[PDB]
Amino acid sequence: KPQVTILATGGTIAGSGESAGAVTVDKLLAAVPAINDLATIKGEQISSIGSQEMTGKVWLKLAKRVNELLAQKETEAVIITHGTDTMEETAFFLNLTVKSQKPVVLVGAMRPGSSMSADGPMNLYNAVNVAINKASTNKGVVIVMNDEIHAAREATKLNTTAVNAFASPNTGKIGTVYYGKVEYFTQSVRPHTLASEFDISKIEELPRVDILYAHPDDTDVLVNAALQAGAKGIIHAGMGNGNPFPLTQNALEKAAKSGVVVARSSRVGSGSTTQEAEVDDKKLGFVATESLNPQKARVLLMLALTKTSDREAIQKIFSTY
Amino acid sequence: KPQVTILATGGTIAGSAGAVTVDKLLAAVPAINDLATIKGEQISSIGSQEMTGKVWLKLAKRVNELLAQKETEAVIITHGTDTMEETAFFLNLTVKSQKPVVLVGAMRPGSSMSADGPMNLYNAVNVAINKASTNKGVVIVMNDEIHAAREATKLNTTAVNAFASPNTGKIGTVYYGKVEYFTQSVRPHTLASEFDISKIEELPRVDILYAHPDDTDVLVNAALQAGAKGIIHAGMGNGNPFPLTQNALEKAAKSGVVVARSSRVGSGSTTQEAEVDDKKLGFVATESLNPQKARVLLMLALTKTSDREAIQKIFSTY
Amino acid sequence: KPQVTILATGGTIAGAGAVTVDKLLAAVPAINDLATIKGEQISSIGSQEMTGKVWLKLAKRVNELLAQKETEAVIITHGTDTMEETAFFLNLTVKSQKPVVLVGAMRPGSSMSADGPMNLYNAVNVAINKASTNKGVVIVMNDEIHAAREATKLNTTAVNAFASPNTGKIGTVYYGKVEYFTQSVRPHTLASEFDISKIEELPRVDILYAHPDDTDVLVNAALQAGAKGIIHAGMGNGNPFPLTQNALEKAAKSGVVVARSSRVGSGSTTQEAEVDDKKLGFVATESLNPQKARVLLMLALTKTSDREAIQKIFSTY
Amino acid sequence: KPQVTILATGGTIAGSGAGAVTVDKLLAAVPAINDLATIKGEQISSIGSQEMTGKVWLKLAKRVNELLAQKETEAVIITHGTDTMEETAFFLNLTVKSQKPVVLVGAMRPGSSMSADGPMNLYNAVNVAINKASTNKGVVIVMNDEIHAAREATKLNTTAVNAFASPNTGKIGTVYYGKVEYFTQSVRPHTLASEFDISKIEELPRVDILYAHPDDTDVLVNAALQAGAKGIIHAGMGNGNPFPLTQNALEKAAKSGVVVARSSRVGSGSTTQEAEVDDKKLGFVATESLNPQKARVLLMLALTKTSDREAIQKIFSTY
The missing domain is CATH 3.40.50.1170 (L-asparaginase, N-terminal domain)
Known part of the structure; x- marks a missing residue:
């Protein structure tokens, strides 16, 4: 048995x-x-x-x-x-x-x-x-x-x-x-x-990753509060194919420039948040999470952040797992 | 033609x-x-x-x-x-x-x-x-x-x-x-519809929060500091909050910011009389909408009331 | 209570x-x-x-x-x-x-x-x-x-x-x-226009399952058994195989109502697609499925076998 | 390129x-x-x-x-x-x-x-x-x-x-x-x-498909047998259930060496073995997680090498 x-x-x-x-x-x-x-x-x-x-x-x-x-x-x-x-x-x-x-x-x-x-x-x-x-x-x-x-x-x-x-x-x-x-x-x-490349055997605390919910007439203040609370990563649950509102994008650009990893997902429910769509990920320093959802993208970004905050490496992780 | x-x-x-x-x-x-x-x-x-x-x-x-x-x-x-x-x-x-x-x-x-x-x-x-x-x-x-x-x-x-x-x-x-x-x-x-935007120049501010394990109070607090009149909480499963976040929403609702529970899941009703005591915490259940539409209905609600009971009736009507 | x-x-x-x-x-x-x-x-x-x-x-x-x-x-x-x-x-x-x-x-x-x-x-x-x-x-x-x-x-x-x-x-x-x-x-x-209060038996309506290399012998056996109606569960938007179509055209000419549905599971079996219903004498069942189209055709046949009247029934209920 | x-x-x-x-x-x-x-x-x-x-x-x-x-x-x-x-x-x-x-x-x-x-x-x-x-x-x-x-x-x-x-x-x-x-x-x-090889085949076995409903019939089973069907797919009600008159004709089909394979009209899910139909006693195959029109194709292929109930059940439980 x-x-x-x-x-x-x-x-x-x-x-x-x-x-x-x-x-x-x-x-x-x-x-x-x-x-x-x-x-x-x-x-x-x-x-x-x-x-x-x-x-x-x-x-x-x-x-x-x-x-x-x-x-x-x-x-x-x-x-x-x-x-x-x-x-x-x-x-x-x-x-x-x-x-x-x-x-x-x-x-x-x-x-x-x-x-x-x-x-x-x-x-x-x-x-x-x-x-x-x-x-x-x-x-x-x-x-x-x-x-x-x-x-x-x-x-x-x-x-x-x-x-x-x-x-x-x-x-x-x-x-x-x-x-x-x-x-x-x-x-x-x-x-x-x-x-999987991830090993949590020696890890006592996972990196902080916030999730933000995108909408019309969106804000910078929730990006700012995530940064102030020491977020290592932010998942943006974007409109449609991972699109931010401009005020929010400007704050995410600032977060990414400070070394906080910005990973684009979607609020919609299904589909890939794709690379080379409307958002210039390479100019702004963002990752596209592709075919996940915000809450699972958060888990993968937490694990990624145990060994890298490099945009290209984290994009490879999202494009692999 | x-x-x-x-x-x-x-x-x-x-x-x-x-x-x-x-x-x-x-x-x-x-x-x-x-x-x-x-x-x-x-x-x-x-x-x-x-x-x-x-x-x-x-x-x-x-x-x-x-x-x-x-x-x-x-x-x-x-x-x-x-x-x-x-x-x-x-x-x-x-x-x-x-x-x-x-x-x-x-x-x-x-x-x-x-x-x-x-x-x-x-x-x-x-x-x-x-x-x-x-x-x-x-x-x-x-x-x-x-x-x-x-x-x-x-x-x-x-x-x-x-x-x-x-x-x-x-x-x-x-x-x-x-x-x-x-x-x-x-x-x-x-x-x-009871709503009348004919002389409205600006809609009430309503933020949306995305719930997850190991959630935070700092995004509720930042929404309050920015003058949120309402908060949609896109909760886990049937509109459930993480404890630290719940306590911040309870504070928000006592302050007279309307807190309306929705869900991150995608479909179904965020129901009354499930695991959250909406009446004790001062919250509204958004029932059969989604966070982004619940935000629109709460923005309109706030053009004529911030009363929890009155806003629950709006969600249970429209 | x-x-x-x-x-x-x-x-x-x-x-x-x-x-x-x-x-x-x-x-x-x-x-x-x-x-x-x-x-x-x-x-x-x-x-x-x-x-x-x-x-x-x-x-x-x-x-x-x-x-x-x-x-x-x-x-x-x-x-x-x-x-x-x-x-x-x-x-x-x-x-x-x-x-x-x-x-x-x-x-x-x-x-x-x-x-x-x-x-x-x-x-x-x-x-x-x-x-x-x-x-x-x-x-x-x-x-x-x-x-x-x-x-x-x-x-x-x-x-x-x-x-x-x-x-x-x-x-x-x-x-x-x-x-x-x-x-x-x-x-x-x-x-509803229908009234079954004094009806003891419903009209016979068969259902046929369409596929490549289809046959006429099941149409023919429905006719021989006294079918008053046939629902054809067609390929895609209600399309028949040629041999089957020819047998259905014969069935319709004999006064047996042929109503086109689909095997696919959802959508309308539409008029004015690839099948000339008016020339062949068929009814398009539109937004039903073969098993429900059979019920509506059985009830239709309590009052009429007219192709135009039956199309209106399918385009109404 | x-x-x-x-x-x-x-x-x-x-x-x-x-x-x-x-x-x-x-x-x-x-x-x-x-x-x-x-x-x-x-x-x-x-x-x-x-x-x-x-x-x-x-x-x-x-x-x-x-x-x-x-x-x-x-x-x-x-x-x-x-x-x-x-x-x-x-x-x-x-x-x-x-x-x-x-x-x-x-x-x-x-x-x-x-x-x-x-x-x-x-x-x-x-x-x-x-x-x-x-x-x-x-x-x-x-x-x-x-x-x-x-x-x-x-x-x-x-x-x-x-x-x-x-x-x-x-x-x-x-x-x-x-x-x-x-x-x-x-x-x-x-x-x-795949075990199938059609390299030498000029004609595939005839397999008819029947559409199940309340107050069903035996005459379409009978016409498929008369036309020389080697196999019949039954698109059954719910989990592949036949109307009793139709079941009796299918049992006669199976006894005559025509392979009867149970599928479903519903659109999704498995037509399962060991449900309400005694497949082993009636000599039927359960097609499991297919649909009638794809079950037809697999039965046509199966019939190019066997008409044995057990062998064809193994095919449907494999492919």
Whole structure:
């Protein structure tokens, strides 16, 4: 039987009303007993928060612990139970810091376990089947939600409330899991996990990266406050294909000239924030984030800034990962 | 032939009438001359990422003047795609007419291979003159689709099919000029709007904040220092803030700056009675909009109230 | 408290004087706080077994119930496979503005994370909501309110399998909170010209699946079986293969109505594209899908077989 | 410069008013392509794609195989009608014995149209065809700035320029003013890895497709059997469910040695094994994550070497 550790970052995603190693994981196994037949489950309570309270300190603790567990010959896979709000940021961060080909599966629930028609039991059961599947090896970190397997690079929460809120808008799901039957149809061709250049093993604090939301009649004062608070990087969630308002652009130009990395993304939801469009990135000293979203671009810029603030090197990073 | 005015806000979206850029549109798409008697005016000459409240107010007041004219049957506005959704939503609540108002643009420049501007503009004229377009509210016509201004958004950076109505869908189609409606909005618009910008010179300042893990107080604080009258928070999932940011928004709301919760996710309602105690913190839930349109509705709300309850009713109505 | 009748067409989708409805109320007791529920069993079949006899029995019973002053709405529990056809049929045969809600479950009641309980609870909330009056027949699934005209099952297994690919949902229902954002502008229900009150059997209408190297033998077999109408699910914008076209032209000349739809899944099968409908004697189904176009053609054939009159029906409803 | 052949299956997809006149007219309409590649042209067929047949698929697959076996040929681009592009692309995806790019491209608007999509689609297709990352991606459809794997592609809309979709996955890449990026690749075997070889085949097996609905019939199953169908695709209700009368005729078909493969009318998702239909008892195949028209192509290929239920289920569970 495969040995799998469930790391809980918060409360139970499945069941309600109630020795693996963490009381939350004991309550999951009691609520979804079918998972005991699939894997020998150990549990740990890695953090004790809602995903809207996530911090870089928790991301570092989680990455280091996932790396320690998957370095163990006895451990086949890790499943992380996670709040849906920021699951895509944690998954993306682990996709570039986990140094293993063994499966890492993040899973959550859009409805509380106490709800009518709670999604957590099926999502967790499916997650365990994905974690133990031979084809999950070397797929990178995945999100399993609503019978779908999403590449961490591509995944996002695209809806506030729907059980089907997770999407991969620039690709689509890489696979399906239906009552535990796992089938992959595609795999990412963007480097992840072992192929990532990033190493957070010695890092205690990630670089500060702010995100700004672009609109008509925009401002310089939020760029200025990010600079004053010691931002190392700024993601600009631009209008359309990463376009700033002029007052904001002038402040971003000043930020870039001071050595703060300015990375253009978009508020729109999907598509690439492309190079050689309307913004003169080379003159103004900006990076184009291409086919990500602001919150995942922030994670990649945080990781980039652990070893470079050079525009050309960071553009290569955005054009590679 | 019906009389329609085309208001340009930038350059040509494709390729006498009273504006050289509209004359160029007519040269580029001469079939439109058989559909309508076209007059042209140049309201601004900017990319839509340069839009300001000043240009929104100038455009809305001029649309209101034109549609009050007995001879004028509809207005078409050519607009950059990046912020077309905000201008359309603003006009949807400030235009006091049932006559058609159609916004149109082009995801590819007029000089491009397979430029989308010619067909978009030709389809927009057909929608503007169609009998069924009356009392549909302001509409965006793109990629053979008719989108209610309330619902419409640019959802992709480059695709010719970048416009969508993620919470509904298109209200109709226009295919080589053939116009068909299948649905209509049941949210009040145009003539049924309470807002009146006829003597407004400047709109209230409303900032937008982008939420993420390890979020900050310093952008709330900078918005307050700059005289924000409202803040849209583009929250994580169902409008959730990071704690440090929440505490700064609570301070902002106690100071009498309206805080309205939206979402960064892209679709769905930022709901009341979820994980945020809006009544205790003094916030508004923006429900089924997006941050950029929620900002437009809060800017209009603030022209007549800063009361949390009154503004929640505005979000739960429009 | 409002009085609602639940009509069951199969078993229980979750977990009065119908045992199946009693089991629903046992499975989702919160519904008893929302409404006084009466229950009837109209059929006891999977939706892949549906027939025109069951559609007619259901429509006439819905009409009787909604004519009662005491009855505020009807909810019908239905298999997902053919819910869109039943909903569309009722949308043109229910002579009332009172809410008619179809609901089902993509996962059996016995499954982990069964969707039936929340779907049914949401369906009752929609059925009793003031704003649901005169919206036409709706499908309520996965927190979404879909117009019967526009609704289709688009996925084999997903709980989010229902969609309105040419519009979108007309509203939402989240933990019982009901909000409409749009309504259909196509006439329905009380405004429908159709009347099935004394109809015992619907006209036969076959559906053909177009592809390269297509055949005439399925057209020919539909004709031999007494088809009154044929829906052709054509390639792209309703295009037939030549051999098939020739057989359809023959079918139309014989007085069997040929209506062009598409296999693609969304969009209009338009007039004035590559097929000369007027010369070949065909109808273009426009913005439907083959399974709903079959329903509208079956109802059309209750009053006419005239190509012009049937085109107007497709261009109206 | 890279040498690419354009095979035209019909008229010009771009423009209005070498080796084939249609390709000469494409190059006159989109001259930027001459900067990218040395283009040769051939007129392989002269039809709208609604008139496609297995004879034309065989001709096309054999000619693509000959051209890609040429050391100097980098890639083939095939201009094709949108209606049945997905069927031709899926057929080539299992019969082209090469990793060199094969790109199918078309236009949802005629080249004479306002805002014709052909010029940019064709320009993009040439950039995909000459991209080194396009090697061993399988046969692809390039439409509307998107790169779709042939296995996953379908036309999902009647008229939209964005009518192409990959509903079970998503596009494998993007091409935006010629800039080619891949994000994913199919993990299902294709092209050089496929077991099928049509080199000796002059005629493909007959496979009919049936459209399921309430109050369904047996007479279309019966007519397919009488016409000598070797296979039937059943486009079932929901997860591939038949009406009972139709199921009884399909069971008779299967007993008579005609292969019955269950698909779905719905548009997306898997027609799964071990659902409500007892496939092993009734002698049916479940087509899983395809659609009826692509399931037809795979069944036609399967029938060139076997009619065994178990072997054909393995084919559908593999490709």
